[PDB]
Amino acid sequence: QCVNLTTRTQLPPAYTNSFTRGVYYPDKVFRSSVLHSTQDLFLPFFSNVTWFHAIHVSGTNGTKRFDNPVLPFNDGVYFASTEKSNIIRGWIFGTTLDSKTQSLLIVNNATNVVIKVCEFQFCNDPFLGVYYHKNNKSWMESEFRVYSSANNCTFEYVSQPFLMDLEGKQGNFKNLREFVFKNIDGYFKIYSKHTPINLVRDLPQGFSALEPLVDLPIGINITRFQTLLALHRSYLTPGDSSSGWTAGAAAYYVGYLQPRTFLLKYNENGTITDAVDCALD
Amino acid sequence: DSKVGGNYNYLYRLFRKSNLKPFERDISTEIYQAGSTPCNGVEGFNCYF
Amino acid sequence: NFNFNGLTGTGVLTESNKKFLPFQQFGRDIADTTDAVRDPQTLEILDIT
Numbered sequence A: 001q002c003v004n005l006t007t008r009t010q011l012p013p014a015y016t017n018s019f020t021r022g023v024y025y026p027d028k029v030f031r032s033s034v035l036h037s038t039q040d041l042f043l044p045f046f047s048n049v050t051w052f053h054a055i056h057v058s059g060t061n062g063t064k065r066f067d068n069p070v071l072p073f074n075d076g077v078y079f080a081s082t083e084k085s086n087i088i089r090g091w092i093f094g095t096t097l098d099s100k101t102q103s104l105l106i107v108n109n110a111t112n113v114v115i116k117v118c119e120f121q122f123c124n125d126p127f128l129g130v131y132y133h134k135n136n137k138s139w140m141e142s143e144f145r146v147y148s149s150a151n152n153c154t155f156e157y158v159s160q161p162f163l164m165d166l167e168g169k170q171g172n173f174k175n176l177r178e179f180v181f182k183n184i185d186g187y188f189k190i191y192s193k194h195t196p197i198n199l200v201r202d203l204p205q206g207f208s209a210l211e212p213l214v215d216l217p218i219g220i221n222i223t224r225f226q227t228l229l230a231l232h233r234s235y236l237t238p239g240d241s242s243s244g245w246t247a248g249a250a251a252y253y254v255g256y257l258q259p260r261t262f263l264l265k266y267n268e269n270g271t272i273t274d275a276v277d278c279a280l281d
Numbered sequence B: 001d002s003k004v005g006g007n008y009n010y011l012y013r014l015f016r017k018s019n020l021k022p023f024e025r026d027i028s029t030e031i032y033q034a035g036s037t038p039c040n041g042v043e044g045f046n047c048y049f
Numbered sequence C: 001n002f003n004f005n006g007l008t009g010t011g012v013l014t015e016s017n018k019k020f021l022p023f024q025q026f027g028r029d030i031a032d033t034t035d036a037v038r039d040p041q042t043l044e045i046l047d048i049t
């Protein structure tokens, strides 16, 4: 059971500058006080990044938008998000995003982390969501509408239980999360880093390198992917399941990787602190 | 893995539109269309399971 | 002489001030020669000269 959301204001995509982000540790080797030359699929420096939003600005001329489009995967994806309220929560990767082909579902649903590879029958407009209660101050996850069915499942993994901070917040964005997704020779490689921020409008300029996390043994073809966002619902938001919702405030960025040669700088503790994109100019 | 009347529990893919990349799996049963002859999921002339 | 998880060679093992990230088992010098290892039973970082 799923629903198509119908109250979005029709607005264009935004574009931004990737600056120097997208570097990650290319191998599990300790090096220090050295410059190293490597070749891999990297976000090019100063690349063109597509900027998507989750936001609700009230008023007659409202701009409510909840962007969860299907984007191409190409040769790998640079994904980053900036948020204050745990809105951007997982993705879908596959070729048809339909019941005819196996695809990968990664969902950070309240209290667990779920990774599944199945022939999923996905919703055309998938979402997660949290309802704000009237008789207390708690927020709870109640809406899980990603797929209507699944079968022929493999590689099933569920993490240990935890509590999730589902409370909505105000102020600037607080958490910058960066990921790199690659699909090579049967493996889905995921790199990640979390950085504290206090910025509002766009990706911060700066440099960091992502750590390898995991390498998932999933033998599937990925050509398209979709971002899963959570909705906020409340006693103050009237309407049926297609209109009775509010976008929270969050944003994400998508770039693409290309073969590049880089000069990486490792400091005295083996941390990559800088880099040169040899094809930039 | 052998049976007197044959062991029909083992399968292999014979028809595909392209070759596999290393370590990929595909368990789709979408019927294969051959000979540029449109097929709506039905075994028949130029359409194979 | 030594064998650290399959990596063999010779040299002098000394205690090191290098700190490996949780997923790094071996280090490398400027010419890609191993010059440090993490011991597999007690997780000390040793330099190799």
Ligand SMILES: CCCCCCCC/C=C/CCCCCCCC(=O)OCCOC[C@H](OCCO)[C@H]1O[C@@H](OCCO)C[C@H]1OCCO
Pocket (backbone or CB within 6 Å): A086, A088, A089, A090, A106, A107, A108, A113, A115, A157, A159, A160, A177, A190, A192, A213, A214, A215, A216
């Ligand atoms: C061989 C098979 C390996 C098994 C799988 C191991 C873990 C693989 C998971 C990778 C990324 C999970 C998806 C993140 C959701 C994105 C949006 C999001 O919300 O995530 C970030 C915040 O929530 C996530 C949460 O962190 C909460 C931070 O607020 C943590 O859950 C952890 O999952 C594994 C251990 O339970 C990892 C970490 O998330 C990724 C950062 O490490």
Ligand SMILES: *[C@@H]1O[C@H](CO)[C@@H](O[C@@H]2O[C@H](CO)[C@@H](O)[C@H](O)[C@H]2NC(C)=O)[C@H](O)[C@H]1NC(C)=O
Pocket (backbone or CB within 6 Å): A002, A003, A004, A124
């Ligand atoms: C959301 O809208 C899509 C159309 O944009 C609906 O999908 C169609 O459903 C009919 C009836 O089953 C099919 O004949 C069409 O071929 C489908 N179109 C596409 C592009 O797939 C979808 O069912 C709606 N979903 C919800 C929950 O309302």
Ligand SMILES: *[C@@H]1O[C@H](CO)[C@@H](O[C@@H]2O[C@H](CO)[C@@H](O)[C@H](O)[C@H]2NC(C)=O)[C@H](O)[C@H]1NC(C)=O
Pocket (backbone or CB within 6 Å): A015, A016, A017, A047, A048, A049
């Ligand atoms: C990213 O690329 C898009 C094109 O894919 C750029 O947008 C175009 O800009 C020209 C003017 O230079 C307009 O005439 C086109 O109509 C725009 N097309 C679009 C948005 O589809 C965009 O400016 C580039 N952004 C960055 C940050 O480089």
Ligand SMILES: *[C@@H]1O[C@H](CO)[C@@H](O[C@@H]2O[C@H](CO)[C@@H](O)[C@H](O)[C@H]2NC(C)=O)[C@H](O)[C@H]1NC(C)=O
Pocket (backbone or CB within 6 Å): A109, A110, A111, A112, A114, A141, A142, A158, A159
């Ligand atoms: C988040 O997803 C997990 C995994 O699917 C849910 O936990 C499972 O719930 C079913 C019942 O629906 C049990 O049969 C499983 O044994 C549970 N698995 C684990 C590892 O606990 C969890 O309930 C979901 N979160 C929310 C808010 O619904």
Ligand SMILES: *[C@@H]1O[C@H](CO)[C@@H](O[C@@H]2O[C@H](CO)[C@@H](O)[C@H](O)[C@H]2NC(C)=O)[C@H](O)[C@H]1NC(C)=O
Pocket (backbone or CB within 6 Å): A133, A134, A135, A136, A138
């Ligand atoms: C805040 O109040 C709501 C009720 O207004 C509580 O939600 C109910 O919890 C019971 C027990 O799990 C369910 O059977 C009801 O169906 C829930 N009601 C609704 C409308 O969802 C909620 O648990 C309370 N918050 C806290 C922290 O206790």
Ligand SMILES: *[C@@H]1O[C@H](CO)[C@@H](O[C@@H]2O[C@H](CO)[C@@H](O)[C@H](O)[C@H]2NC(C)=O)[C@H](O)[C@H]1NC(C)=O
Pocket (backbone or CB within 6 Å): A151, A152, B027
């Ligand atoms: C994938 O799942 C389907 C179920 O949706 C399995 O369906 C088989 O269908 C044929 C008829 O076309 C039956 O004769 C078989 O008995 C069904 N299988 C089972 C286990 O009951 C299909 O076999 C599954 N394929 C894989 C690779 O797991």
Ligand SMILES: *[C@@H]1O[C@H](CO)[C@@H](O[C@@H]2O[C@H](CO)[C@@H](O)[C@H](O)[C@H]2NC(C)=O)[C@H](O)[C@H]1NC(C)=O
Pocket (backbone or CB within 6 Å): A267, A268, A269
């Ligand atoms: C390597 O790590 C050491 C700590 O183990 C760093 O030295 C400390 O840096 C903090 C600031 O972040 C100071 O407050 C401490 O007083 C420093 N301690 C000592 C003993 O000097 C060192 O800066 C790191 N080196 C690099 C290149 O990042």
Ligand SMILES: *[C@@H]1O[C@H](CO)[C@@H](O[C@@H]2O[C@H](CO)[C@@H](O)[C@H](O)[C@H]2NC(C)=O)[C@H](O)[C@H]1NC(C)=O
Pocket (backbone or CB within 6 Å): A095, A221, A222, A223, B017, B018, B019, B020, B021
């Ligand atoms: C991975 O998925 C893509 C997209 O479905 C496959 O490329 C398509 O192949 C069909 C023939 O089966 C062509 O008609 C389409 O024009 C192709 N699309 C594109 C964008 O190239 C690709 O073959 C799949 N990879 C593997 C190993 O099967």
Ligand SMILES: *[C@@H]1O[C@H](CO)[C@@H](O)[C@H](O)[C@H]1NC(C)=O
Pocket (backbone or CB within 6 Å): C040, C041, C042
């Ligand atoms: C057994 O393994 C533990 C953990 O790596 C280590 O601390 C301990 O010294 C090892 N012990 C032997 C050979 O007794």
